[PDB]
Design a protein around this ligand. Structure first.
Ligand code: SF4
Ligand SMILES: [Zn+2]
Ligand SMILES: [Zn+2]
Ligand SMILES: [Zn+2]
Ligand SMILES: [Zn+2]
Lengths: 351, 754
């Protein structure tokens, strides 16, 4: 009675430097009382969460937002590295209400040309939030399907608690013909995890492609406050940074330089990918009796592990999630939180 | 896969297998050992064709005796499905073993789709396309071509390059599917019609519609070399008893009677004009009648036969001189005496079902023409027309029906029925009498095919119960067993909407008309699906006229815009050409993002041959009970015959037959175990017929699903879709219903040898 992936085929190329513009539906379909306020308002509530988390888990990526109203698609946020512009946009969109019907193809092409300026290293991907059962297409979608795949842009979409075969085909078509990207929801928490699994990069098996090196520099913080003066926005900045090359007083931003146009990053964003890059194997729950290890947690101090021949209480299980590489145990609360937040296996860290 | 049934390798084309298939494989070989009938029910959700072909193809390649295999399907559309399936299996059989085929296997549809001559192919009517190429490539026309150099006779030239290269050998080695065949034949500018025509004695397996086995007018070229020691395979043959009686059915109209006079009088001119020119051959043909039936050149006809054998294939035939009818002038005279008597019998003011004997005696009382020589009309007309070498058939089209009919009724008695309606009730109070005629027992035509062979295979995913047909066709099978769908998941929700949102017992039996209490409830019931259902949804009316009846008022109702506001709507069209264009576009729209919704008739042709995969088959609708007594007591007449012949009454047979046709439509929602779709039904009486269903269908029906409301059913199907839409891939319990590749069938079944 366990719901776990048999193995995690992460080990190599994933989607790290990302250029995702998720597309929403703003139609009468999103207006209906499927979720407690409705689809859209709860979704807008739900959608807000991922934005910062996307920028949290993937600060090395850029993102804009497009919606679809009354049989027409409408971009609503610029592709940027700052959540706030995207964040503040949804607040109006929260106070805005979905209307009419969505135009899939309008979103198809508006986003398609939107991703044209994206560089090769920045990985192009799109995700869709759809509620209806039909589209509004000014032309041959399969042509656009052909156009997108010719652009080599894999895509995952998540419709509502239903299936669309072409959308099932589209996620298939976008993703090298591999259909694992039309997963749909059945519950709000089951919807919540969709956000939770979305922040992850996307390794399956990347074809041997041109791999590009990157050159940039770190920024240097400005100290004075009374000297308030800004260049990237022509403002007065009571504290900022300096480009490694153009050497411009720049406000706090891990984004690209505005003068010689180079990426400015200190350290934090880099190691975020690292634990993503090489994660650990799950701490294996050691057996109730075949383990016979120390009656305590390893990461934490959880002296209770079972119940010791207590009829079924001990025959239930043994909170003995043991990392295999370290051969050291961990309490489930510790072990799950470890794999949840910080891989950093102390048993493997200690050597 | 390559396993054994204790005697033969099984080169199964797919890595996966299914539990039904091995049980299917268990019985087919067992039946193959003891050549019998063995009516079996195999669920349509599973692809029985794979289980069908694989064991059979190996059987011929393992057992060295049955070199000829025969499969009869309902449609040539199924044939091309079988044609590629065999081709894929044949490729796989070579793929697993190398090259061990040396095999000849082809389909058989018609000249219409196999006459590759563009001009003859351009013509619309199947009769003309057959007749044109028959005339264009004729045994006598080529004489008019070869003996007298002229442009008067052209040729297909596909039949000629057939005689040039093709009639020395076969097509090189392909098991040509219709696409592959047509692609090959066109590049060879060949005629797949004449190819299979000569390839009758060469194909190691032949696939064709039941009629080439059933319809004696086309089941006449039967060669015992490919027939006698062969095996006959049938799937979805439940809706064939009607076809058998239909194959002996014959409707008449006084307009055609005038057309008969049109042709028959034209015969007088045709025989007289040649008589002035060359009656010596006609006199010679009289000697050819004096020696006998002129089988020397009424059968040995490469492209000559004008009148085919509409009666059973020459079983009930005499061959002596027709007394005085030897003279063509006499021959037409009795015919002319007959058609007017037929007219005098057509002009009956009311509907009369006349016995074959009493009507014949009544004819004898009116026109003293004898029964036995009357059968000679078909042979004499085929004989005379070619001697007349007529250049047209349209005036004579009515005549061959008489040559058909006059021979038929003169050959048939107390198993057939002649009934003379004075009009059609749907357009009553106007003169349009029909001298309707047909058989009564389907097994009559099945008896010779029963007689000719022992190894015969019948299967269906619809047949229920498997006992009516042995009663109906009066035969003994070996194994009468039904197979159940080994599904660890629902994959279909059988729903009996006896009660609507109004909770009203809703029905189609009340009338063939509209009552918004039932109808608008149905319209309101339907629309909610359009919103929730994805692309792919069809309805099946009991009657096309009933179909149109509900359409206009629902169009008048505001119900029509919303479903268009939700999905796309495509209609069933009387011409299949527009229907086909609708169907592909419907599937195209079903393949497209914009949802597609269809509407058909439970008796419609779509339920006959057209299957629909997961996306294409999602939500089937049974518009009330499909019932057929909208028409006259000709149903009852055969049913009364049925009731006296067999201890089966109307409703018992009706429920059996109606649910047979109901289940006939429903088999098209599924492609494989990956396929799924809710099966909704809306009629009050549907709850009663829970027993009449096929086993797996009945097994899939829980008792809690009876007389459900649409609203509660909406909730029921609501969760079903998402679960099915969810990627349910346990990959461990699947092997229970998959019998994992080449291992579990080897492991489990060999373990289950106890
Ligand atoms: S010769 Fe062949 S292609 Fe031409 S009409 Fe006859 S069957 Fe068709
Ligand atoms: Zn600034
Ligand atoms: Zn700079
Ligand atoms: Zn702990
Ligand atoms: Zn460890």
């Amino acid at each position: 009675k366990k719901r776990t992936a048999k193995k995690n085929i992460t080990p190599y190329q994933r989607g790290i430097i990302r250029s995702l513009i998720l597309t929403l539906d703003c139609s009468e379909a999103m207006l209906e009382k499927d979720l407690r306020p409705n689809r859209h308002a709860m979704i807008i509530q739900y959608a807000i969460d991922f934005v910062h988390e996307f920028f949290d888990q993937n600060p090395i990526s850029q993102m804009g937002i497009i919606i679809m109203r009354n049989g027409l698609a409408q971009l609503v946020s610029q592709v940027s590295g700052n959540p706030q512009d995207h964040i503040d946009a949804l607040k109006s969109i929260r106070k805005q209400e979905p209307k009419g019907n969505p135009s899939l193809q309008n979103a198809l092409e508006m986003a398609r040309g939107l991703l044209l300026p994206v560089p090769a290293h920045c990985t192009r991907e799109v995700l869709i939030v759809f509620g209806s059962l039909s589209t509004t297409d000014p032309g041959d979608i399969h042509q656009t399907i052909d156009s997108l795949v010719s652009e080599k842009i894999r895509v995952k979409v998540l419709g509502l608690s239903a299936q669309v075969a072409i959308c099932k085909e589209l996620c298939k078509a976008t993703n090298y013909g591999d259909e694992s990207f039309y997963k749909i929801l059945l519950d709000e928490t089951h919807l919540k995890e969709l956000f939770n699994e979305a922040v992850t990069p996307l390794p399956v098996n990347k074809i041997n492609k041109g791999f590009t090196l990157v050159k940039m520099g770190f920024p240097t913080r400005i100290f004075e406050d009374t000297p308030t003066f800004c260049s990237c926005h022509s403002k007065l900045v009571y504290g900022g940074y300096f480009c490694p090359n153009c050497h411009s007083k720049v406000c706090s931003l891990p984004t690209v330089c505005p003068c010689c146009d180079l990426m400015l990053i200190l350290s934090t964003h880099l190691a975020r990918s690292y634990h993503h890059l090489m994660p650990l194997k799950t701490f294996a729950e050691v057996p109730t009796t075949e383990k016979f290890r120390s009656e305590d947690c390893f990461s934490c101090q959880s002296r209770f592990p079972x119940x010791x021949x207590x009829x079924x209480x001990x025959x239930x299980x043994x909170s003995r999630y043991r990392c295999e590489d370290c051969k050291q145990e961990f309490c489930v609360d510790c072990d799950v939180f470890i794999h949840e937040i910080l891989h950093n296996c102390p048993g493997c860290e200690s050597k | 896969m390559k396993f054994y049934i204790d005697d033969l390798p099984v080169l199964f084309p797919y890595p996966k297998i299914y539990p039904e298939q091995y049980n299917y494989m268990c019985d087919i070989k067992k039946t193959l050992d003891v050549g019998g009938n063995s009516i079996l029910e195999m669920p349509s959700g599973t692809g029985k064709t794979v289980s069908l072909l694989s064991l059979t193809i190996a059987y011929q390649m393992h057992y060295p005796e049955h070199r000829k295999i025969i499969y009869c399907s309902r449609t040539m559309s199924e044939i091309e499905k079988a044609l590629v399936e065999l081709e894929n299996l044949m490729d796989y059989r070579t793929k697993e073993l190398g090259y061990q085929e040396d095999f000849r296997g082809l389909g058989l549809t018609s000249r219409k789709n196999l006459c590759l001559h563009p001009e003859v192919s351009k013509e619309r009517k199947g009769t003309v396309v057959d007749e044109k190429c028959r005339r264009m490539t004729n045994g006598q026309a080529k004489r008019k071509l070869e003996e007298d150099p002229e442009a008067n006779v052209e040729l297909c030239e596909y039949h000629e390059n057939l005689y040039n290269i093709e009639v020395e050998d076969y097509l090189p080695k392909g098991v040509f599917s219709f696409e592959k065949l047509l692609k090959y034949c066109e590049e060879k500018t060949l005629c797949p019609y004449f190819i299979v025509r000569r390839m009758i004695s060469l194909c190691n397996i032949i696939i064709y519609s039941y009629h080439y086995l059933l319809d004696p007018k086309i089941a006449e070229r039967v060669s015992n070399e490919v027939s006698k020691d062969s095996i006959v395979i049938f799937d979805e043959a439940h809706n064939i008893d009607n076809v058998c009686i239909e194959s002996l059915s014959l409707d008449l109209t006084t307009d055609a009677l005038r057309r008969a006079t049109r042709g028959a009088n034209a015969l007088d001119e045709r025989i007289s004009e040649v008589r002035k020119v060359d009656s010596q051959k006609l006199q010679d043909e009289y000697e050819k009648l004096v020696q006998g039936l002129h089988s020397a050149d009424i059968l040995t006809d490469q492209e000559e036969p004008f009148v085919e054998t509409p009666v059973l294939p020459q079983d009930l035939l005499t061959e002596a001189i027709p007394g005085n009818i030897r003279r063509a002038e006499h021959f037409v005279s009795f015919l002319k005496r007959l058609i007017e008597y037929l007219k005098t019998r057509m002009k009956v003011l009311h509907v009369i079902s006349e016995t074959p004997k009493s009507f014949l005696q009544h004819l004898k009382q009116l026109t003293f023409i004898e029964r036995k020589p009357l059968r000679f009309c078909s042979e004499r007309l085929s004989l005379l027309v070619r001697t007349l070498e007529v250049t047209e058939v349209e005036d004579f089209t009515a005549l061959k029906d008489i040559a058909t009919f006059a021979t038929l009724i003169s050959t048939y008695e107390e198993g057939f029925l002649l009934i003379i309606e004075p009009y059609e009730i749907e357009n009553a109070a106007v003169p349009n009498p029909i001298m309707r005629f047909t058989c009564l027992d389907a097994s009559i035509a099945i008896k010779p095919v029963f007689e000719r062979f022992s190894s015969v295979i019948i299967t269906s995913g619809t047949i229920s119960p498997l006992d009516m047909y042995p009663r109906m066709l009066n035969f003994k099978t070996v194994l009468q067993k039904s197979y159940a769908m080994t599904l660890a998941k629902k994959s279909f929700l059988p729903m009996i909407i006896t009660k609507g949102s109004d909770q009203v017992a809703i029905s189609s039996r009340f009338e063939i008309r509209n009552d918004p209490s039932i109808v608008r409830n149905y319209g309101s019931m339907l629309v909610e699906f359009a919103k929730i259902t994805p692309d792919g949804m069809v309805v099946f009316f009991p009657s096309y006229l009933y179909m149109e009846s509900i359409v206009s008022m629902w169009q008048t109702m505001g119900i029509l815009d919303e479903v268009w506001k939700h999905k796309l709507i495509l209609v069933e069209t009387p011409d299949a050409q527009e229907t086909s264009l609708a169907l592909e576009t419907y599937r195209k729209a079903c393949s497209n993002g914009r949802g597609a919704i269809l509407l058909s008739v439970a008796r419609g042709k779509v339920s006959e041959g057209i299957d629909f995969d997961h996306q294409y088959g999602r939500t089937v609708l049974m518009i009330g009970i499909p019932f057929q007594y909208t028409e006259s007591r000709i149903l009852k007449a055969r049913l009364e015959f049925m009731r006296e012949n067999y201890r089966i009454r109307e409703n018992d047979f009706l429920s059996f037959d109606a649910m047979r046709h109901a289940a006939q439509c429903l088999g098209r929602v599924l492609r494989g175990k990956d396929d799924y779709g809710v099966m909704v039904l809306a009629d009050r009486r549907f709850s009663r017929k829970r027993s009449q269903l096929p086993k797996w269908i009945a097994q899939g029906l829980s008792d809690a699903d009876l007389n459900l409301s649409t609203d509660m059913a909406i909730s029921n199907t609501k969760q079903f879709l998402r679960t099915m839409a969810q990627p349910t891939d346990p990959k461990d319990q699947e092997g229970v219903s998959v019998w994992s590749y080449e291992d579990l069938i080897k492991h489990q079944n060999s373990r289950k040898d106890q």
